[model samples]
Target chain A: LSPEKRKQQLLDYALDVFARRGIGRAGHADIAEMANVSVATVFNYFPTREALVEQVLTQVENRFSTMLQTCMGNPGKPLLLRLNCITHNLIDAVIEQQDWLKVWFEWSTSIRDEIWPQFTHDNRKSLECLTEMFAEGLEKQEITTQQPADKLAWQLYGICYVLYLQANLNPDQEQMRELADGYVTGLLGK
Target chain B: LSPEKRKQQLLDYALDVFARRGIGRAGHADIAEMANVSVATVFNYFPTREALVEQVLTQVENRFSTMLQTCMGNPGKPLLLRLNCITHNLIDAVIEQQDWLKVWFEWSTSIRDEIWPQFTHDNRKSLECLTEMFAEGLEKQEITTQQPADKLAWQLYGICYVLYLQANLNPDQEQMRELADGYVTGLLG
Candidate 1:
């Protein structure tokens, strides 16, 4: 495999293993086995165990950030459409990459709290844009209620987090769609 | 130690380990070592890995629910005071049991979703009670926000969860207090 693809593949395996085993207890052997590679190969790519785990985590965030930044907006799109699109994109990524999500939070809480900017500058902008969309929706009278735009933003995000937390275990795509749509309806319109 | 005492001690150690290490990765041996008991003793009390984890998690929920349901509120105490008191009590518990806090959410996601009722039925009650408290405050004109009471309750709980998640990671009690207290004041002032 090409260096880029191989690294990504290995990182995916690392995330799965790390999510299954705590990062502290998982060894290089586990990562190597998860990736279906030799122990020697694992070392060549990552000289230190800590470096490997850390890099895999960085890789996880980088992937999500890249996807989110890309589909964050489209010019002159309807606010509701754009907002729902981003929500779907986010839900897809989070649901599929739950193992990564699980490990990322664990790492953030336990080991390297300072390294905790999963919300990259662009990611923050995406959140800001989400709030702006809510405000715009309210201005247009698409949403009936007059909740504060910032609180609405958090409310929307919290619903997603709560629903997505369930999705990771249940794998109910229809339920995920319903919950996400229900939240939007509650805020905007049915 | 008495059998009951030993079992309880084992469960506590199990929570610490399961929180620190993923449940799937943690074995009876790890739980035994953490509790400084033999692996045989673990199986004697809870024969399987699954049983031990299940019981320990139940213990976690039982402890929290008892504390939370007890101090939830009474009409005479003043809404904001009761809310803040429960908030501090919860923050203290979560921060002190950061390990279990870590595992609870993670375990619910990964291991057994059935175990998630730890947050569900009980949490549903907590959220409802909180909303009722907030609505009563609004009626008394102690609070000014016009948002529906149910949504308002969720907003407050969401802030607490988000802040506490960060607090566990970052250990900023001062910031947690400021933000949590700020949220209440924003709602009630």
Candidate 2:
């Protein structure tokens, strides 16, 4: 295989190691073994362990992009309906990609290193999307939290993640919807 | 020779091992070595690993009761103040206990067996206390959320555990208190 192929293969397998063994416990040798390549090859391509981890997570982030695309709904609908589709999609994505949750938790717990522009861009984009969705919902009289739109967006973010982590790691849609309703409705002042 | 004393010693050392390595990853041999006894002795007292883990957690549960007592305050005080005291106490206890957060996540995610009676009772009592505490707070106007106290209690419970799990494993009181205020205030309003 080409050097690029070898590099991509190693990155793909590394995620499995991280998901199963956690980022801290996952070793380069395990990644190499899984990739069916020499440990020396891993080191040559990714000079530092931190770089290797960042690359692995970037790949995971790309997969999440696919989830976002798949979960995209009719923008023409009431904002609440569109937002609900994305929220459920994200919840399902987090559950299916065990590696994503591992990376997410690791980052939240101060474990993961950042990839600068992409990291900040992703964070801002998520919050902005939430703020936009809720702002529209508020404008249309679909809900009534009366809190500032920006602040309500942040609250929704907190409530979703808090419940997701505290609830079963992978609640089915029914349960996910229930917890989602509790917080979203609570935010709506209903 | 005495079963009770032997069980006590096993339970004590097991906590040490739990603090060092998460209970999920802990081993029977490790428990035996830490307890300074043979593996046979460990199994003799606790037949299965599940029994061993359940007993160890029961002991941990008792220690947590001390936190409840330490943070206990007057019912007449602002509800936020009293609940704040308990919340901070639990946060500090989790931090001090080394493996508390990890084990908490592991158990909640499903690696440990629940020992009913005590386990079920403890869960019910926590929610009960939160309900009574908040129901009264709404009445006195110390806080303002109209959410039902019983249901709101569960919301607070989830909010605390989520933020605690998301927060650094050992954040100081000031940091914890800040996040607690956000959730409580939001719930109160």
Candidate 3:
């Protein structure tokens, strides 16, 4: 395989291990075995554990960015239509991607001592994407709510967090859709 | 000291220690030191560590109930008024009580192994209180939104959780207030 392809393949293995065994316990040996490569090869591709984790995060965020484009980037789409599309997708993501949600939640919390800053910065970037989308809605007079763009973004982000938390207990898809949609509809400015 | 008073005092010390040292690290000896009492005495009032922690949670929930009463339980208050009152108080609590919030965040998450059920159940109880309040508003036609009372309660609860999480980053009181109020207003149906 080309070096780029090999590196991508290794990172894919690493992501699976992290999702399964958790980020804290995911070691290079595990990735090596999963990828059917030597431990030495894993190190050559990513020098440090930190670098590997960072790349995995970058990969996840890139996927999220693509989802953002698919949902919110359509020009002339009604603001509410785009918002509902993203909200439904997020709810589905939290329920369907339990392993990823577990890893994401653990990393975002203060449980990991040194890795705190990076995860938070990543969260801020995600929040910023929502804020920019809302700003565009405001410019077009689509979202006439009194809240500023950032606050509106946070409201939506907050709702998603709550949904993710509740999914840990008992996930009722119908109720989740109702709560998420109700909050979204309530925010529609007159 | 009377048995009731002694038990209350030990629990107070336990609450302080749990707030500062964290729920996972709190021990009998720590509470004994904080209360200037013997470890034996600590155990006497509460036979087991589990019992002690449960009582401490009860105390905290009682305090929360009191706050809810003050804000949401009043008769003839507007639904929005009650909600804004609770939201402001919650924002202030998350900011002023960092130690409490730390334990709260940790306990509510899946970090504590076997202790998870109790904390999550405790969280549900708190959510229920807000739901009951909203239900009252709906019955009186104070809230006209399409959402059932439970959904509105979750929306309010979710907003508070977000504010608490953001408090860990860099709490901006003004910004938090505006965001919280805006969400609360948007919920008013």
Docking class of 2: incorrect
TM-score values for chain B across all models = 0.77, 0.75, 0.82
TM-score of chain A of each: 0.67, 0.76, 0.85
Question: What is candidate 2's CA lDDT for residue B165?
Answer: 50
For candidate 1, lDDT tens digit of each residue in B76-145? Answer: 6677786677667657756676565565555444432345555465456656777887788788777654
> How does candidate 1 score on lDDT?
0.62
Model 3, span A12-36: residue lDDT tens: 8777776654454567887888888
Top model number, DockQ = 1
Q: Compose the digit string of candidate 2's lDDT tens values, residues A44-69.
A: 98888878877776776665555544
lDDT of 3 by residue, B1-189 (tens): 888888878887777776654453568887888788899998888888888887876666566667777896557777888888887777777668644554555455442245668767766766887888888888888777477777777777677766766665656778777767767766673
Ranking by lDDT: 3, 1, 2
Clashing pairs in 2: B145-B188
Off by over 4 Å in 1: A18-26, A34-36, A74-82, A93-157, A166-178, A181-190, B75-82, B94-98, B111-157, B169-174, B182-189
Candidate 2 residues lying further than 4 Å off, grouped into runs, are A20-86, A94-98, A106-158, A165-175, A188-190, B1-23, B28-54, B57-82, B94-98, B109-151, B162-170
Output the better candidate (2/3) by lDDT.
Answer: 3
lDDT string, candidate 2, B1-189, tens digits: 588887777777776665554453467788888777888888888888888888776666555544454454665877777777766765665566445444443433231124323444545655577788778888998776556787676666566554555344446767767766666666666
In candidate 3 chain A, where is summed lDDT lowest over 10 consecutive residues? Answer: A105-114
